[PDB]
Structures are given as structure tokens and as C-alpha cells.
A paper describes a structure:
[name] is an ubiquitously expressed, multifunctional protein that binds to both DNA and RNA and is known to regulate replication, transcription, and translation. It has been shown that [name] binds to single- and double-stranded nucleic acids that contain GGN motifs. Nucleic acid-binding of [name] is mediated by three central PUR repeats, which are N-terminally flanked by unstructured, glycine-rich sequences and C-terminally by glutamine- and glutamate-rich regions. Besides its ability to bind RNA and DNA, [name] possesses dsDNA-destabilizing activity in an ATP-independent fashion.
We present the co-crystal structure of [name] with a CGG trinucleotide-repeat DNA, providing a detailed structural explanation for nucleotide recognition. Crystals of [name] with a GCGGCGG trinucleotide-repeat ssDNA diffracted to a resolution of 2.0 Å. The DNA-bound protein shows the typical intramolecular dimer with two PUR repeats tightly intertwined with each other, forming a globular PUR domain. In the crystal structure, the DNA molecule 1 (DNA 1) is clamped between residues of PUR repeat I and II. PUR repeat II binds DNA 1 with the residue K138 of its β-sheet, and residues N140 and R142 of the short linker, whereas PUR repeat I contacts the DNA 1 via residues Q52, S53, and K54 in its short linker. [name] mainly binds to stacking guanine bases, but also to one of the cytosines (C5) and to the sugar phosphate backbone. Instead, F145 from the β-sheet of PUR repeat II stacks with the neighboring guanine G4 and thereby blocks the space for the cytosine C5. F145 of [name] shows particularly unusual characteristics by undergoing aromatic stacking with G4. This protein-DNA interaction blocks additional DNA-base stacking events and forces the DNA to flip out its cytosine base (C5), leading to a strong twist of the DNA 1 strand. In the crystal structure, an additional DNA-binding event was observed for PUR repeat I. The residues Y57, D59, K61, K70, and R80 of the β-sheet interact with the 3’-end of the second DNA molecule (DNA 2). All other mutations showed reduced DNA binding and only decreased unwinding. Together these observations suggest that the heterotypic stacking of DNA-bases with F145 in PUR repeat II stabilizes the single-stranded conformation of DNA and enforces a twist of the bases that is important for its unwinding activity.
Numbering used by the authors: 40 to 183
The structure:
Amino acid sequence: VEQELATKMLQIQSKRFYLDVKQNRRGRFIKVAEIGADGRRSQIYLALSTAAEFRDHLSSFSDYYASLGPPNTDNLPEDGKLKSEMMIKDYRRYYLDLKENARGRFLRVSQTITRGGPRSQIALPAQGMIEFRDALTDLLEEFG
DNA sequence: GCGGCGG
Ligand SMILES: [Cl-]
């Protein structure tokens, strides 16, 4: 029992993103879906307060990204976060990591509760963060 | 036209 309240769709590189504001008996939330070029779906759910936090943080990630030069690569593998933030809502944790690999820079958004439990993540090309931010802002202006 | 380092 989830009533749809508003939607936005974005095409970013080979991916499509849907931002949907919905409501159930406990309240309102925003669902963020990533659809890969092959059709693979990944989704995260956000309280509206968390969504606004997310929207706020995207600007600093974009500022940081815009200032970067070329990666540089030694001869060992690397994870490395270029930049990290974490958000919390109740028992849910959201990790925002700006990362680089051979496929470019991207924002990893990961949702977790416990080590042995359900996990969800989306991966947003760094070039799409401004567009994504402004889409989130449009929905936030209409809700909560 | 991708593609995102797990248990
Ligand atoms: Cl809330």
C-alpha cells in the first residue's frame, strides 16, 4: 500500500534514474532507482529529512569533483574514497563515497543496517550529480 | 557505451 505522489526520470550516461516520492501508512519517502543499460535495477529508500541531507551534500561533492585533476595510478590496486560522508536515519546508515576507477569518477551511495543483512547501493556518474541534485530539489520544494 | 572490488 504505497501511493505514488510525484516522479522524476533522468538519463545519465548509460543509466536511467527514477526519483519517486511515495507514501504508505507510516509516512512519506523518496525511492531512488538506478536502471543499468542492461535493465538491472538497484534501489534505495530515503526519509524526506535524509533526502534533504543528501541534496545538501551533493553540492560539496560536485565542488570537489569539479576541482580534480587526472587520477593517478601507482602499480598497486586502489580503493580509496576521494571524499566520504555518512547519513543516519533510525537504524539505517547511508554512505556517500566519491570514487574513481578506469570508468571515471562516480558517487557511490550505499544503504546498510547490519553486516549480515539486506544491502542496497546506487552508482551515479560524477558528471550527473548536478542534474540529480536539481531534480531532488524540485521534489523537495513540493514535499515536507 | 560502458561501469563501479565480496565473503
Ligand atoms: Cl522525515
